[PDB]
Amino acid sequence: QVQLVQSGAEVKKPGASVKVSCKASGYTFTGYVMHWVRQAPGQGLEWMGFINPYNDDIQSNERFRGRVTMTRDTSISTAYMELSRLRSDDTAVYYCARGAGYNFDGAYRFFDFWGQGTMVTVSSASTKGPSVFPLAPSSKSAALGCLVKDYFPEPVTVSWNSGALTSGVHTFPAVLQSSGLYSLSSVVTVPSSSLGTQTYICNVNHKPSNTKVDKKVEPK
């Protein structure tokens, strides 16, 4: 039960700083090194650096030397990365990735366990929470969904009946409107009959605005 659990998504204006945390569970924290790797949207992978939390030894990628700051707190089993003087082209997903070498072994040069990641958006534009509208089921013998419109920045997450309904769902990649705000749809297929039986609710979360909405989706 190795688990690396990172901090939630954030938004920062150009020239500012962001601090991403990564918290380990179910192993000896000091035994393994901790790397950081990023992914810009629709792009490849880039390695930033590591921190060996035993001896505080550090390597870094030349590109970030001056701007990046990797630290660690052994009492709480957490590693940090702090990047600053943020340009717009630092908008990306930021992962923490554990090295496979226990106690100075050479296997640290590859990664065996990753975190869930942290989307960091660099923008002068304001934060804005979404509006959630139902996509009511057809009058026809069965698909319904939720429309999440006008939010910034990314991302959001959608679940159904507090995570109970999982089969048949497709949550779509967001779409950048001309207004500068994001919008996506989530849909799901269910049995023809069971519209009168079941009571469907979509749970939308947008953490940068601190918005939680539990919207009913029913025929009219």
């Binding site: 490849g44 992978l45 050479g106 990664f111 509208f133 139902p134 749809s185």
Partner: protein, 217 residues
């Protein structure tokens, strides 16, 4: 830095056949301690990467034995014996001998499970969105192959263009099909001035252009 160069960036292949990705480095990758630190990661949709092969030929625990690596000097090769539906994703080769660590561009795997038509679903805008002066109509295609589709919105049989965007999901893990979501955006004012709303859907898995429609507003 060491540049990493993968051969086919886009590799489609039918289930049960051999698949082979090449990878290539600007320098040799033998560390002073004798090992060759070259690896293979796989990224599926909505997930972080996962290690398959490490130090050229060693399979990671959990990985099926149909995956295997090889190579020496500057040329390295990932090989899959029997390609299956769960293999879909992006395959990165990586180098860790020298600093900084550098990856390849990534190679997407498409699976050539063939011909299947969509299940269309139109949606009228909600009663609560219409209060705030905008109207979104949504046309949902669902579970189709190949990816190539075309949606034409029509309002009172007038072909609308340049006022709708579409978004498409990745190829699925199990059924190996895509899904699509187009969205026509109008004002509340213009929405009420028409009545017949429809999306026309052409696809090589269908005989003739299927269309679904409604009427209010």
């Amino acid at each position: 830095d060491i540049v990493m160069t993968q051969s086919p960036l886009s590799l489609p292949v039918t289930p049960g056949e051999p698949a082979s990705i090449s990878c290539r480095s600007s320098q040799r990758l033998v560390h002073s301690n004798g090992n060759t630190y070259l690896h293979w990661y796989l990224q599926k949709p909505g997930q972080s990467p996962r290690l398959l092969i490490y130090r050229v030929s060693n399979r990671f625990p959990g990985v099926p034995d149909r995956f295997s690596g090889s190579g020496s000097g500057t040329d390295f090769t990932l090989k899959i014996s029997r390609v299956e539906a769960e293999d879909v994703g992006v395959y990165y080769c990586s180098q860790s001998t020298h600093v900084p660590y550098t990856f390849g561009q990534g190679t997407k795997l498409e699976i050539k499970r063939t011909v299947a038509a969509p299940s269309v679903f139109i949606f009228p805008p909600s009663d609560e969105q219409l209060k705030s002066g905008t109207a979104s109509v949504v046309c949902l295609l669902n579970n189709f192959y190949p990816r190539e589709a075309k949606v034409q919105w029509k309002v009172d049989n007038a072909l609308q263009s340049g006022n709708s965007q579409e978004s498409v999901t990745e190829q699925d893990s199990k059924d190996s099909t895509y899904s699509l979501s187009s969205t026509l955006t109008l004002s509340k004012a213009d929405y009420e001035k028409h009545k017949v709303y429809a999306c026309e859907v052409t696809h090589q898995g269908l005989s003739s252009p299927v269309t679904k429609s409604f009427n209010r507003g």
